[model samples]
Target: SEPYQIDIRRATNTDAWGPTPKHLAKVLRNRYQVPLYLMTEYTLKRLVDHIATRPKNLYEKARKDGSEWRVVLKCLVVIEFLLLNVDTGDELNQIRSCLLTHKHILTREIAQFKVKFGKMEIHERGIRKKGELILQYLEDSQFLKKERAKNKKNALEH
Candidate 1:
């Protein structure tokens, strides 16, 4: 399947969120090599709302069914928090707690499923892959944030 490309442009004063999709697209494109396709305002708003309001229980359940899906959902939430510039360490800890809870629920559900399927190998592999993905996403985002901070500092110094 062809990759979806959404261009992120710079935010204008008129933008409701202060950051245009184009701006975000540009950052992703330049830093992460992601190509963003321009989406309609309504579509963007819907996506933002969905990400912001996604239920923790549902996210946890998805982890139980599919680890990859859960990682993606968690990553989306992390990205949203980053975009909001939320700096409260307590809030971040809460998010981490949520993710850990989701992971715990998924592990229990997988254990139950293993009993029914009698196939521990596949489930174990899925768990490992999902866990790795989540870890990698966290590490990569940390690096990206550090780089962003460095860039900001450099811009200010110039």
Candidate 2:
């Protein structure tokens, strides 16, 4: 079998902050390994939407750049989502599985980001909302949630 190869082109900036649509499209294509031809405006919009809602880390220098911070945070969230949800190979799966093991740490980091973003007053709500969004995306993408049922008959059958 031939190894899949992709050409990634860096996007140009019209302003100092946001990437042009073309650049964003290129990012989606290269990062997800989705063909450039299949990338549509709707898909790009969805990606941008996800990025816009991501929280930023206060201590990070990138967060000091205003619009750039939002864009960078969005890209990070998209990458994390793709890593956890899309890639199914054992190496990637193992990496994603590690997130489950460090669930508490991940939660703490997100909380810290919330505090940095000045939404600490609604920190719990923010955490819940972020969690719900991720779970909804997973469910929409057909990723099954782990379920445990306790019943003597069911246990015996398993």
Candidate 3:
């Protein structure tokens, strides 16, 4: 079971215009349905691979400073959109549950990633902010419960 559909390599290919790919974001937005289980398995691993690895040469340097950052941005962007698509508790729980042990490694990298970008002198704060936001959703059980309960409370109120 490979998550070949949304390959990070394909998604992170940026042009002269911007870091985030407009077409990819739109594609994910239009699709709506996200493979939470699949992404949490394969794609999360891919994200971690790019983030967790150390870069040495100039090429590798650009690889990380450039596409690697975009890779993280794209993954987080797609994930947030998925979580925000609708307030289906079952779907949220499914997404929340899928990001377990193996998938959780991305959290460790993302935390360091945010700090790494923060020390630099660039507008990468957006990527760091997005990383922070995603981890808040992915790692915080209390936050997830609060989010779920808010939606739960609203359902009963209405």
Top candidate, metric TM-score: 3
lDDT by candidate, in order shown: 0.36, 0.37, 0.55
- Model 3: per-residue Cα lDDT at residue 136: 80
- Candidate 1: deviation at residue 90, Å? 1.6
Q: What's the TM-score of every candidate structure?
A: 0.26, 0.32, 0.56
User: Compared with the true structure, what per-residue lDDT tens digits does model 1 show for residues 1-158?
Assistant: 11222222222222324344445444333323321212222223333343334335655646642222233233233234233232335433443444444453334432222211244466455544544544443446686356445544543342
Count of backbone clashes for each model?
15, 0, 0
Off by over 4 Å in 3: 1-4, 7-11, 16-35, 52-65, 102-106, 114-120, 138-158
How big is the positional error of residue 72 in model 3, measured in Å on the Cα after superposition?
1.2
- Over 4 Å off, model 1: 1-84, 104-133, 137-158
**Which residue pairs show backbone clashes in model 2?**
none
Better candidate number, 1 or 3, judged by lDDT: 3
Give the least accurate 10-residue stretch of model 3, judged by summed lDDT. Answer: 114-123
